[PDB]
């Protein structure tokens with residue numbers, strides 16, 4: 001009983017300045033929707049869907065006349081096509097990673113000016129409150145976050161001095177972090193998601209170049225393995241999964257800003273370009289309408 | 293009375309950091325296309341000392357990468373050539389500068405996350421930078437004016453909030469003192485001196501771009517609004533030529549302005565006198581000195 005009419009949202013991003021675009025792609029018919037724009041333009045933000053509502057978390061408003069790190073949590077309702085402000089986070093978080101467990105949004109890492117966060121906080125939609133949980137073992141900005149077996153995985157990033165290939169796993173019931181096996185490649189701003197019980201890490205920045213390589217983590221073998229690489233090299237990419245296929249949206253390749261949207265098929269182990277965004281951008285917040 | 297003075301505009305930003313050097317003559321209304329900067333940059337500040345234009349600080353903002361500048365480059369109008377001078381101790385994007393007794397003061401600015409309260413002074417004869425007493429507040433996007441041999445730092449951004457505050461530097465004592473705060477919060481506003489009053493035109497208050505203009509009389513210690521500009525503009529270049537303020541370019545929230553307005557203090561009115569060859573923001577502006 002698969003759900004029909006699910007939409008891959010893309011919120012915010014950067015192209016010469018921070019963007020406020022909210023657009024929705026339908027993978028079935030291949031159409032794009034031009035939805036209500038963000039109140040404040042934002043890049044380096046993260047997107048997630050909880051209970052039929054899209055959330056935009058953290059980021060930064062990069063403009064020609066100054067920069068401002070965001071602690072904002074804004075909620076988009078598809079029925080009304082309207083953004084509504086929620087309770088803001090305890091601290092601003094640019095280049096943030098987020099994950100959802102038991103209907104609560106986890107805000108992981110990110111930066112506030114010079115402060116590279118290892119702190120993590122949890123949002124409860126029912127009472128509109130943020131609360132700090134156990135902090136990470138490593139400071140991480142540009143961190144990719146994945147949820148698997150009711151555990152939160154923080155993958156890659158940048159601690160302020162070193163660019164990270166390491167990763168750690170959070171345990172909500174115990175409230176503690178534990179380091180897992182490090183990746184084969186150093187990655188900051190990589191697209192991290194979960195597909196068929198494996199944590200993927202696509203693209204990112206290794207300190208030298210933007211990456212097109214993709215590797216997945218099998219939790220039982222505790223081993224990172226390379227799969228088919230993407231066509232285009234990209235960091236700060238939006239990522240998500242829809243009906244057994246990973247979708248990577250936009251990004252930055254060291255020179256241009258990508259409008260390309262590649263689609264990974266795990267059965268054949270091949271990437272294919274399915275569509276293009278209305279304009280090239282990086283640092284977007286991406287999510288999908290939930291299954292059921 | 294010197295004639296043939298030129299309003300220079302160096303650097304700027306449109307899509308990426310620019311390396312334009314153009315000069316406007318207010319007398320005949322002509323534009324000159326002079327030698328380009330060796331490295332493109334925006335958020336810089338321009339000043340003239342002894343017949344030589346200087347380009348201080350800034351930021352090479354491009355799609356390939358972003359790099360804050362600690363560079364001092366000197367333009368000679370006789371040779372139409374840029375020459376590199378001794379660099380500053382630290383990079384300073386969105387810098388403010390003022391000249392006192394032939395020395396260039398580099399005030400505030402940013403180096404990535406770091407918002408400077410530090411100030412350093414350049415000696416053209418020795419080609420040396422030296423740190424003086426730091427400001428009481430960290431300021432980026434600060435406007436600098438020089439009146440009665442005192443340097444005034446007006447407005448800006450301290451890393452958390454945009455500022456309406458201002459402070460005055462005393463070169464002989466080497467210390468800063470807070471003056472009366474502005475009526476409006478301003479970052480990236482055009483600050484200059486005219487008829488013994490420190491003007492503060494436009495800017496960015498965090499929410500919107502401003503068209504309002506207010507001036508500070510040093511004796512009354514009071515900020516007072518004057519006639520506002522036609523266009524709302526932040527990150528604008530500003531200068532004074534024969535008793536009239538000239539604001540060049542800027543950013544209005546949507547477009548990058550090519551407009552150049554001119555303020556007449558006798559009538560308290562602005563008027564569009566010319567257009568730049570292309571719209572831009574974060575330009576370094578200065579004028580040929582008067583006798």
Ligand SMILES: O=C(O)[C@H]1CCCC[C@H]1C(=O)N1CCc2ccccc2[C@H]1CN1C(=O)c2ccccc2C1=O
Nearest residue numbers: 014043044095142188189236252282283355356357358
């Ligand atoms: O995040 C920021 O501070 C600002 C800095 C100014 C540009 C926007 C943004 C930024 O740099 N991002 C996007 C968000 C994001 C999110 C996660 C990881 C990395 C990033 C990097 C990716 N990236 C670059 O490194 C870069 C360098 C130069 C131009 C454009 C870019 C670019 O798009």
Ligand code: NA
Nearest residue numbers: 017041062063
């Ligand atoms: Na903006």
